[PDB]
Design a protein around this nucleic acid. Structure first.
Ligand SMILES: [Mg+2]
Ligand SMILES: [Mg+2]
Ligand SMILES: [Mg+2]
Ligand SMILES: [Mg+2]
Ligand SMILES: [Mg+2]
Ligand SMILES: [Mg+2]
Ligand SMILES: [Mg+2]
Ligand SMILES: [Mg+2]
Ligand SMILES: [Mg+2]
Ligand SMILES: [Mg+2]
Ligand SMILES: [Mg+2]
Ligand SMILES: [Mg+2]
Ligand SMILES: [Mg+2]
Ligand SMILES: [Mg+2]
Ligand SMILES: [Mg+2]
Ligand SMILES: [Mg+2]
Ligand SMILES: [Mg+2]
Ligand SMILES: [Mg+2]
Ligand SMILES: [Mg+2]
Ligand SMILES: [Mg+2]
Ligand SMILES: [Mg+2]
Ligand SMILES: [Mg+2]
Ligand SMILES: [Mg+2]
Ligand SMILES: [Mg+2]
Ligand SMILES: [Mg+2]
Ligand SMILES: [Mg+2]
Ligand SMILES: [Mg+2]
Ligand SMILES: [Mg+2]
Ligand SMILES: [Mg+2]
Ligand SMILES: [Mg+2]
Ligand SMILES: [Mg+2]
Ligand SMILES: [Mg+2]
Ligand SMILES: [Mg+2]
Ligand SMILES: [Mg+2]
Ligand SMILES: [Mg+2]
Ligand SMILES: [Mg+2]
Ligand SMILES: [Mg+2]
Ligand SMILES: [Mg+2]
Ligand SMILES: [Mg+2]
Ligand SMILES: [Mg+2]
Ligand SMILES: [Mg+2]
Ligand SMILES: [Mg+2]
Ligand SMILES: [Mg+2]
Ligand SMILES: [Mg+2]
Ligand SMILES: [Mg+2]
Ligand SMILES: [Mg+2]
Ligand SMILES: [Mg+2]
Ligand SMILES: [Mg+2]
Ligand SMILES: [Mg+2]
Ligand SMILES: [Mg+2]
Ligand SMILES: [Mg+2]
Ligand SMILES: [Mg+2]
Ligand SMILES: [Mg+2]
Ligand SMILES: [Mg+2]
Ligand SMILES: [Mg+2]
Ligand SMILES: [Mg+2]
Ligand SMILES: [Mg+2]
Ligand SMILES: [Mg+2]
Ligand SMILES: [Mg+2]
Ligand SMILES: [Mg+2]
Ligand SMILES: [Mg+2]
Ligand SMILES: [Mg+2]
Ligand SMILES: [Mg+2]
Ligand SMILES: [Mg+2]
Ligand SMILES: [Mg+2]
Ligand SMILES: [Mg+2]
Ligand SMILES: [Mg+2]
Ligand SMILES: [Mg+2]
Ligand SMILES: [Mg+2]
Ligand SMILES: [Mg+2]
Ligand SMILES: [Mg+2]
Ligand SMILES: [Mg+2]
Ligand SMILES: [Mg+2]
Ligand SMILES: [Mg+2]
Ligand SMILES: [Mg+2]
Lengths: 96, 52, 76, 64
RNA sequence: CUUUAAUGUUUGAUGUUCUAACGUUGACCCGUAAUCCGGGUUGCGGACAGUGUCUGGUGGGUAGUUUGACUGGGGCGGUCUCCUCCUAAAGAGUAACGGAGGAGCACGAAGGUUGGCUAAUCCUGGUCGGACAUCAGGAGGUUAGUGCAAUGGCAUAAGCCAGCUUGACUGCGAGCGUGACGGCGCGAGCAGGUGCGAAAGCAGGUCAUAGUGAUCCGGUGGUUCUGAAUGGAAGGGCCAUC
RNA sequence: AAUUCCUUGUCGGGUAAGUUCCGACCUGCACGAAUGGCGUAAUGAUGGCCAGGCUGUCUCCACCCGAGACUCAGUGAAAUUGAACUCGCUGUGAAGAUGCAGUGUACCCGCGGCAAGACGGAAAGACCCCGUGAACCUUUACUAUAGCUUGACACUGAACA
RNA sequence: GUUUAUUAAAAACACAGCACUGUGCAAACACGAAAGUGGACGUAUACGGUGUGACGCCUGCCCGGUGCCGGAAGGUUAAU
RNA sequence: UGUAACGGGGCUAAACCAUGCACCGAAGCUGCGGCAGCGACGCUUAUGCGUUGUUGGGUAGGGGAGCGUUCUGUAAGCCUG
RNA sequence: AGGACCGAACCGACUAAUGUUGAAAAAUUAGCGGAUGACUUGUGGCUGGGGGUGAAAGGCCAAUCAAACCGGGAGAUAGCU
RNA sequence: UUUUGUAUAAUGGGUCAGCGACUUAUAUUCUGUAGCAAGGUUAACCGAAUAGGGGAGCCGAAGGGAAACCGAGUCUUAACU
RNA sequence: CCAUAGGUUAAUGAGGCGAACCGGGGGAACUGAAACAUCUAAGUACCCCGAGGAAAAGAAAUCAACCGAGAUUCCCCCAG
């Protein structure tokens, strides 16, 4: 980043924002990952056993990415709108 | 640079303010303009306060 | 001595010449005064900048009793 | 050893989807009563790093 | 409350005295065969001095360093950012310690709009009144005007008066100009709300181009966006601003 | 004037002739009274000037005595060095040529001499500039700091006013 | 008399003298984290520092600046 | 320093002007042969072979392809009194 | 009597010449100053590097001094050759 | 070698022989190549062991926003043509 | 005065050396920051003390997050 003695680009520009500690313990889930668990139920403890989200994660959303075919109970996790339509069309049952 | 700078506080209760300058030597009386307040989305009279 | 100064070149002039198709909003002439004047479908900016209000070809022409130079955008 | 991130540049840039970097504009921190509202309004949204100075950013931010 | 005493205790300030801390580079005794030292007796000093921590001053005694560049060599002198003209070779751009001038503001109207108006100079006539005030006519036709330098504009006036006013609006912005970049500039239109106008319309500061300062750090207001077990808070973020 | 720029000031002395010297003048660029002022006998491997004696200092060198140089025998270095079949001139050319062009001259090789050139040898110029080089040194540069000094608390108590 | 051993012996340093100033003795001062030691087994006719530099005649005016000394009423002012 | 202001010899044209035809003159161009690069095109590709155009001065620098050296495997092999 | 005088030893180093890959990393030759004093000399001791020591030249401190020598940080750093 | 430019009278080399300068480790990116492919891959360690185990992790298949949060969208804004 | 200090014996032990590793007491600067003072180099070099075959640390007044883990040391991650 040394530009001669000119004030460099990484110091001409201002700092912005902060880092959310809560963002480090959230995760996003494909619909293709819902079949990779066993038992057809999805909890936080089920996904960590399936090695999908990781141990320190405490919050998770399900996102329309990939596709699901088997009926899968989703329990205690946030679901987006397109993933809610895709889970319920394949036979799923989103609950808390 | 005798022309100091002030701020025009909204009288709509919001803390919204326009900032501007005035010559306090030649205009001792306070500046009051009716300006748009984007929080209330109305034109409200603003009054001069100190820039502080 | 006493003559070291000069200012930066403001890069005025005519940016799009005649018969040259432009988009709406394209700057045609930058200038100090109204050395040129705004004709049909051409706006005059705050600093007397002439920009195109519509799309089409640039037409330079001299009109009026004072023989002033007007810039218009022909339809296309 | 690992490369160390220039930690000042990590506070100024964020990598976007196609690999470009967004950043806050300058000139919007102090001395604001003399600037036009049109000028400031075009400085609030984040802008992309231009193609010329994009090489120096990647050298400062090796871990994306 | 205005106007001040009593009683007692509530601890400081300065005398005032003492001995028991402490000092003794006073005398004497012993360890001892010893001008060190330690112990003992005694005298003098005495809560002072003197040391520790904290603290203000002083501090080239000592230490670490800084002390710009351009430059028809260096120093001396001048210069360093920004605007205008020429050099600039009829697009843009274009250097020199080339030729000439300015800026570091101002304005709550000198902004917006509607309505209206048109200069400089000279000639003649006219109380004070004169080279030159004001008045009336004529020539003249912008040789004037523009808050300020120069250049380009300016009569539909952008020049000059008056009325009403705050668009010197907030969110945006197709598309271009200009830069290596940071950035700077122009912008129809859209959403909201507004001013003037009967209306068409015009208004996102001023005839345009100078009137300026990155980031960091910090201040102020706003905003639950964040809040390290949890609820708050601190702090941070974002918006405005210094 | 150990100080005077102008300056070789002017005047006087000394000399045939004196930018120095000596004595005056004062117009002290820019003397001056313990960073002492002005004198001053004696002293000085001290500075300037003058005279006598003396002389190869010189006019202007001559000869002589020895030590080298020179020759023979013995021993036997050194600095330097891209390579050499290593001329002059005028011109040219990284702008002062043994090497280029034109031209002139010149049989091959020593020895004793001289030092004009080989931008000769020796020392990565000390001068000058440069480096965001170094070192010491200075101060009312900056920031510290030993030291000195101030007060609070502690070691530290008792009475009385 | 001294001095740049190895380009400078001098008008430089030193010097006797003179003056200013500090210093009452566990002296000032100096070397030492300190203990100590030097000053000095000395005691203001002594010791340290500074300037001047035999001797002769002398040494004028200025305390605004910068230091130093003395002052303690007021202003300002640290830890606490 | 030496002619030393055509390169010299020399020249009254072997100078100058005009016109004309010759010739000389370079690593330019053509001929003949050889190598290579990059494009075309086709092949019947051995993943490159004919033909075909065209290219081939080069520092800094970028790209492509190699030679040789020592050591290890191949190698208790092969060469060698 | 004398930091008295002249002058050898002894101590010093004013001038010239030589020498300058020397006889010599400061000397020789001819002169020169001091030579009873603040003299000179033998032996032994003590003072240590931001320190000593200095009749003061930034002199001397083992042929080295505007901060000795040796070892270490150490392959300091060198936008320079 | 350095240069705008050197026969340069600019630098360097007396000669020969030997030695003498772009490496190594770890990160990271790109290109080539190979393995597998919406997955790829293990690190310590175990293991008698260049095997096999080990999937802790890391990278990728989703992004936007300062952030909560939303999600093939999201942010901006009262709301976006 | 007792006493104590001191004295004389006796017994046991220590002393010194050694490469690295270890714990502790002290502790730079060049350098980097394109200067430089905060900072960096780095608790590094060095000095000093003590120890052992290893030393050190070590059995929660520790984490965690409303679920739980269960001394110390070491390795790979977390993660530049
Ligand atoms: Mg700068
Ligand atoms: Mg996992
Ligand atoms: Mg802000
Ligand atoms: Mg200093
Ligand atoms: Mg330093
Ligand atoms: Mg310079
Ligand atoms: Mg100059
Ligand atoms: Mg032009
Ligand atoms: Mg042109
Ligand atoms: Mg105006
Ligand atoms: Mg009008
Ligand atoms: Mg106007
Ligand atoms: Mg204007
Ligand atoms: Mg800063
Ligand atoms: Mg909390
Ligand atoms: Mg909350
Ligand atoms: Mg807490
Ligand atoms: Mg004088
Ligand atoms: Mg003179
Ligand atoms: Mg004479
Ligand atoms: Mg005379
Ligand atoms: Mg003479
Ligand atoms: Mg005289
Ligand atoms: Mg004097
Ligand atoms: Mg005096
Ligand atoms: Mg004197
Ligand atoms: Mg012989
Ligand atoms: Mg020959
Ligand atoms: Mg020549
Ligand atoms: Mg000869
Ligand atoms: Mg010669
Ligand atoms: Mg000779
Ligand atoms: Mg010569
Ligand atoms: Mg030479
Ligand atoms: Mg040199
Ligand atoms: Mg003498
Ligand atoms: Mg000498
Ligand atoms: Mg001498
Ligand atoms: Mg004593
Ligand atoms: Mg003196
Ligand atoms: Mg006096
Ligand atoms: Mg005074
Ligand atoms: Mg006074
Ligand atoms: Mg005082
Ligand atoms: Mg001649
Ligand atoms: Mg002819
Ligand atoms: Mg050819
Ligand atoms: Mg051919
Ligand atoms: Mg060719
Ligand atoms: Mg080639
Ligand atoms: Mg082999
Ligand atoms: Mg004598
Ligand atoms: Mg001597
Ligand atoms: Mg002699
Ligand atoms: Mg004698
Ligand atoms: Mg000196
Ligand atoms: Mg020596
Ligand atoms: Mg030293
Ligand atoms: Mg030093
Ligand atoms: Mg180091
Ligand atoms: Mg080195
Ligand atoms: Mg070379
Ligand atoms: Mg050169
Ligand atoms: Mg040159
Ligand atoms: Mg040549
Ligand atoms: Mg030569
Ligand atoms: Mg050469
Ligand atoms: Mg050179
Ligand atoms: Mg050589
Ligand atoms: Mg790969
Ligand atoms: Mg692959
Ligand atoms: Mg440092
Ligand atoms: Mg540095
Ligand atoms: Mg242990
Ligand atoms: Mg529990």
């Amino acid at each position: 980043g040394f530009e001669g003695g000119q004030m460099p680009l990484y110091r001409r520009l201002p700092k912005f924002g902060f880092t959310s500690r809560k963002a480090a313990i959230t995760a996003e889930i494909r619909l293709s990952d819902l079949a990779k668990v066993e038992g057809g139920v999805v909890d936080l403890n089920t996904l960590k056993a399936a090695n999908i989200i990781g141990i320190q994660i405490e919050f998770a959303k399900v996102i329309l990415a990939g596709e699901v075919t088997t009926p899968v109970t989703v329990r205690g996790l946030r679901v987006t709108k397109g993933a809610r339509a895709a889970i319920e069309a394949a036979g799923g049952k989103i609950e808390e | 640079g005798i022309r100091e700078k002030i701020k025009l506080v909204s009288s709509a209760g919001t803390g919204h303010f326009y900032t501007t300058t005035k010559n306090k030597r030649t205009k001792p009386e306070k500046l009051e303009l009716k300006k748009f307040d984007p929080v209330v989305r109305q034109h409200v009279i603003y009054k001069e306060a100190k820039i502080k | 001595t006493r003559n070291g100064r000069d200012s930066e070149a403001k890069r005025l002039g005519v940016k799009r010449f005649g018969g040259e198709s432009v988009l709406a909003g394209s700057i045609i002439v930058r200038q100090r005064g109204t050395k040129f004047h705004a004709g049909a479908n051409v706006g005059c900016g705050r600093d007397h900048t002439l920009f195109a209000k519509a799309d089409g070809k640039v037409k330079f022409e001299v009109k009026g009793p004072k023989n002033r130079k007007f810039i218009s955008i022909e339809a296309e | 050893p690992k490369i160390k991130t220039v930690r000042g540049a990590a506070k100024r840039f964020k990598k976007t989807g196609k690999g470009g970097f967004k950043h806050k504009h300058a000139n919007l921190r102090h001395i604001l009563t003399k600037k036009a509202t049109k000028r400031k309004r075009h400085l609030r949204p984040k802008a992309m790093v231009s193609k010329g100075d994009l090489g120096l950013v990647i050298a400062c931010l090796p871990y994306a």
